[PDB]
Homo-oligomer: A and B are copies of this chain.
Amino acid sequence: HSHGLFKKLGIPGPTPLPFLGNILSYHKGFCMFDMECHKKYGKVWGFYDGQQPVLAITDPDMIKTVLVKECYSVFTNRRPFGPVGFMKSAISIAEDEEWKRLRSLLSPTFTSGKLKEMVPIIAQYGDVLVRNLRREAETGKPVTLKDVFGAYSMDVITSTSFGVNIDSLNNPQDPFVENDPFFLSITVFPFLIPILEVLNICVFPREVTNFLRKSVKRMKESHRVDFLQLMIDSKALSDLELVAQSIIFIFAGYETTSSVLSFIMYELATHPDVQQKLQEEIDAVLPNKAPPTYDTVLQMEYLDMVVNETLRLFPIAMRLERVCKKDVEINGMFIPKGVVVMIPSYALHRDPKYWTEPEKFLPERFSKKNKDNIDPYIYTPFGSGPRNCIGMRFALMNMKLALIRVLQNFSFKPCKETQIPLKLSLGGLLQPEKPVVLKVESR
């Protein structure tokens, strides 16, 4: 019974219940629980995910020590969840030297030279997204963004990860990836995890994967550029190791790209002045609906300010977590072994200590005048340090290339069904209660 740990260290926090800990406070959500704790407990507090002590830090120098300084020594891996199966070889689930080999083997896949080669492929579906948009604009009714953006993010994934060119929205019969009530029990009962592993049970639907893996056996052997072809050229890797990384690239590129693009278009439709100014910049850099290029995207500054400010209001990861590998003492406080150090990214992005009017959508926070006054460890939408988001530059380029072609042809206004203000899904995922619906008018 380690529930007396945070009071044995003099660290404030909510009082844990037996077995459950503080998981009953998650009825508001992880975001609201972190904002309420940071408000009443200060810079450092602790809580218990069942029997697992979780220490939350908000000090920028202390965050820098965890994410960047003592990364390879103390804070190398995140906390493990339940039955992972063969997915233990995922770069995000790998630990210690196992991860260092994968992070070094997959880093060249996200080079500035390799990414510029991917711009023409994902810009093709930017035209396909407009094709499905023009129809759902000429059909004359509000459009659910997560459908067209989910299809776009799916098409971008398949062509960049394997090259299987599909129109996910127009070919939904073959998607082929249409893929609390247990994870609440799994964290309070971590002793049941080895039982599910020996039963071949996994948190992911285990019957999947196998149909995505046998497709790599025919195309890897029996001039095209994609994530797969860049991994085969590369001690050396395994065939099953190649499958696990491609699965984590789809999960990290599907729900993330669509949700952020959904939050962005919600902020643009609710702020026509920002949408008006952004479309003027898009028309200025790209005259007469010019095709967006790699060098063109990296020039539009107001587009970068819009993407950065929406990621502040909605950091879809919510938290940054590291596992304390041994008894250490960082920046003046003692961290015992086994404690999960957590960085509340959502709570820090809405703190009046660093942001003026946190609930407001003000893209001018990230202009070249005020961008220098932003702490790189208070604003971490992609994490930081050696274990940051390895697909950060790919996601930014993928999302912006869609925002240009979408705004080059359409203006977005709210509808009667648009949930204003937007209510964050009290669930576990950082999304909105009711899906975003907007009016799409042709320019």
Give chain A's interface residues, CB within 8 Å of chain B: 51, 97, 190-191, 194-195, 197-198, 326
Complex Cα–Cα for A51 and B194 (A): 13
Q: How many copies does the complex hold?
A: 2
* B191 pairs with A198, CB closer than 8 A: yes
Complex Cα–Cα for A4 and B190 (A): 29
Chain B hits for A194, CB < 8 A:
190-191, 194
A26 to chain B, nearest CB (A): 22
- What are 8 residue pairs bridging A and B, where the CB atoms are less than 8 Å apart in the complex? A51-B198, A97-B326, A190-B194, A191-B194, A191-B195, A191-B197, A191-B198, A194-B194
Q: Kindly report which residue of chain B lies nearest to residue A196, judged by CB atoms.
A: B191
Q: Kindly report which residue of chain B lies nearest to residue A200, judged by CB atoms.
A: B1
Complex Cα–Cα for A370 and B115 (A): 73
Chain B hits for A190, CB < 8 A:
194
Chain B hits for A97, CB < 8 A:
326
A183 to chain B, nearest CB (A): 18
User: Which of A51, A190, A198, A326: most chain B Cβ within 10 A?
Assistant: A198
Main secondary structure of the interface of A (DSSP, over half): helix
Q: Kindly report which residue of chain B lies nearest to residue A199, judged by CB atoms.
A: B191
A45 to chain B, nearest CB (A): 26
Chain B hits for A195, CB < 8 A:
191
Q: Kindly report which residue of chain B lies nearest to residue A190, judged by CB atoms.
A: B194
Q: Kindly report which residue of chain B lies nearest to residue A327, judged by CB atoms.
A: B235
Known: A190-B194, A191-B195, A194-B194. 4 other contacts (CB 8 A): A51-B198, A191-B194, A191-B197, A191-B198
Complex Cα–Cα for A100 and B375 (A): 42
Complex Cα–Cα for A198 and B2 (A): 11
Q: Kindly report which residue of chain B lies nearest to residue A51, judged by CB atoms.
A: B198
A343 to chain B, nearest CB (A): 27
Complex Cα–Cα for A190 and B195 (A): 9
User: Which of A97, A191, A197: most chain B Cβ within 10 A?
Assistant: A191
A401 to chain B, nearest CB (A): 42
Chain B hits for A326, CB < 8 A:
97
Complex Cα–Cα for A177 and B326 (A): 37
Q: Kindly report which residue of chain B lies nearest to residue A97, judged by CB atoms.
A: B326
A84 to chain B, nearest CB (A): 15
Q: Kindly report which residue of chain B lies nearest to residue A194, judged by CB atoms.
A: B191
A215 to chain B, nearest CB (A): 25
Complex Cα–Cα for A97 and B327 (A): 12
Chain B hits for A51, CB < 8 A:
198
Chain B hits for A198, CB < 8 A:
51, 191
Complex Cα–Cα for A194 and B326 (A): 21
Complex Cα–Cα for A227 and B340 (A): 38
Complex Cα–Cα for A350 and B149 (A): 73
Complex Cα–Cα for A51 and B198 (A): 10
A326 to chain B, nearest CB (A): 8
Complex Cα–Cα for A194 and B196 (A): 14
Chain B hits for A197, CB < 8 A:
191
Complex Cα–Cα for A287 and B159 (A): 94
A290 to chain B, nearest CB (A): 54
A176 to chain B, nearest CB (A): 29
A125 to chain B, nearest CB (A): 42
Complex Cα–Cα for A195 and B97 (A): 30
A7 to chain B, nearest CB (A): 19
Q: Kindly report which residue of chain B lies nearest to residue A195, judged by CB atoms.
A: B191
Complex Cα–Cα for A190 and B191 (A): 11
Q: Kindly report which residue of chain B lies nearest to residue A191, judged by CB atoms.
A: B194
Q: Kindly report which residue of chain B lies nearest to residue A19, judged by CB atoms.
A: B198
Chain B hits for A191, CB < 8 A:
194-195, 197-198
